[PDB]
């Protein structure tokens, strides 16, 4: 009575009457997402219906994790929670979780290959880093930032779509069998920034092994010290490739490609796109870089931050929805 049902392909969205004009804008393993209009807030929203949250303990655990992080994380550069609801009236009936977010206009996929000025390039990158820094402060290291999971609006604002864990943006740590730390996310920021400048994908590998080869072809074969950190079996492959010297960042990103500034961008790129993470720039240093620091505002860039049965997870999730 507070709710109505809309058929969305083979799926039924049963949602508060305030949400109208539902249309499917995507799906995946964990949910189906519709664009909608919210009649109470008077704005466009994205409505995500979780897919099989209680099929097993692993689904339930992830669903619980997502709900909590969205509630607790609040930052202008991270997709926020507008609302959560279930159409069911009790724990015994409880089945469906609906998460409501602000509706963004686009992801970065096409936008970054349209040629942008330095102001838009650096402003967008500034917002990305602010989002990431806030994720890291909450103990979330993404590991899978790409243009498709970073969203924007026609007013040049930007939010990170999800909390992470197309291989083009995956750091060498991820590609190979390695440990990672916070700066794993810096690699992905670098790949995006490079793509903005050059107008196409930097390292377009045709498979997971090929992804590695396109990286070294441009940047150079990593040092012996780095090779030592590899697991034995990945090391046997990696270490025995032809030896590439790489190209300087002037060769990779010459003035021709750009709209003091281009020199500053190259410098930043040369520090983000480092194969060996122990020699790669941190998020804090990236935010302080002359190319990025022009936008600095501490309220944005220095903002303050187990085992259960299925029915136990249901209960914990139901509490969270309520």
């Amino acid at each position: 009575n507070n709710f109505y049902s809309v058929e969305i392909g083979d799926s039924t969205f049963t949602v508060l009457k305030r949400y109208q004009n539902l249309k499917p804008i995507g799906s995946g393993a964990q949910g189906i997402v519709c664009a909608a209009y919210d009649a109470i807030l008077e704005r466009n929203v994205a409505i995500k219906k979780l897919s099989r949250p209680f099929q097993n303990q692993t689904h339930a655990k992830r669903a619980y994790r997502e709900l909590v992080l969205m509630k607790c994380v609040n930052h202008k550069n991270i997709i926020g929670l507008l609302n959560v609801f279930t159409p069911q009236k009790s724990l015994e009936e409880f089945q469906d979780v609906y998460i409501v977010m602000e509706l963004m206009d686009a992801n970065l996929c096409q936008v970054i290959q349209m040629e942008l000025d330095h102001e838009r390039m650096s402003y967008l990158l500034y917002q990305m880093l602010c989002g990431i820094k806030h994720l890291h402060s909450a103990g979330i290291i993404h590991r899978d930032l790409k243009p498709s999971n970073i969203v924007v609006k026609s007013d040049c604002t930007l939010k990170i779509l999800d909390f992470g864990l197309t291989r083009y943006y995956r750091a060498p740590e991820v590609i190979l069998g390695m440990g990672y730390k916070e700066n794993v996310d810096i690699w992905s920021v670098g790949c995006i920034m490079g793509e903005m400048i050059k107008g196409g994908v930097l390292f377009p590998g045709t498979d997971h092994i090929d992804q590695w080869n396109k990286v070294i072809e441009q940047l150079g074969t990593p040092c012996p010290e780095f090779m030592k950190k590899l697991q034995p079996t990945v090391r046997t492959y990696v270490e025995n490739r032809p030896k590439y010297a790489g190209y300087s960042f002037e060769k990779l990103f010459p003035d021709v490609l750009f709209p003091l500034k281009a020199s500053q961008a190259r410098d930043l790129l040369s520090k983000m796109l480092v194969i060996d993470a122990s020699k790669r720039i941190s998020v804090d240093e990236a935010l302080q870089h002359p190319y990025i620091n022009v936008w600095y505002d501490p309220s944005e860039a220095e903002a303050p931050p187990r085992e259960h049965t299925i029915e136990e997870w249901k209960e914990l999730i139901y509490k969270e929805v309520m």
Binding site: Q110, V111, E119, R120, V152, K153, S154, C156, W295
Partner: peptide, 9 residues
């Protein structure tokens, strides 16, 4: 510098 307020989609 003032922040961009537009972006082409």
């Amino acid at each position: 510098p003032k922040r961009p307020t537009t972006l082409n989609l």
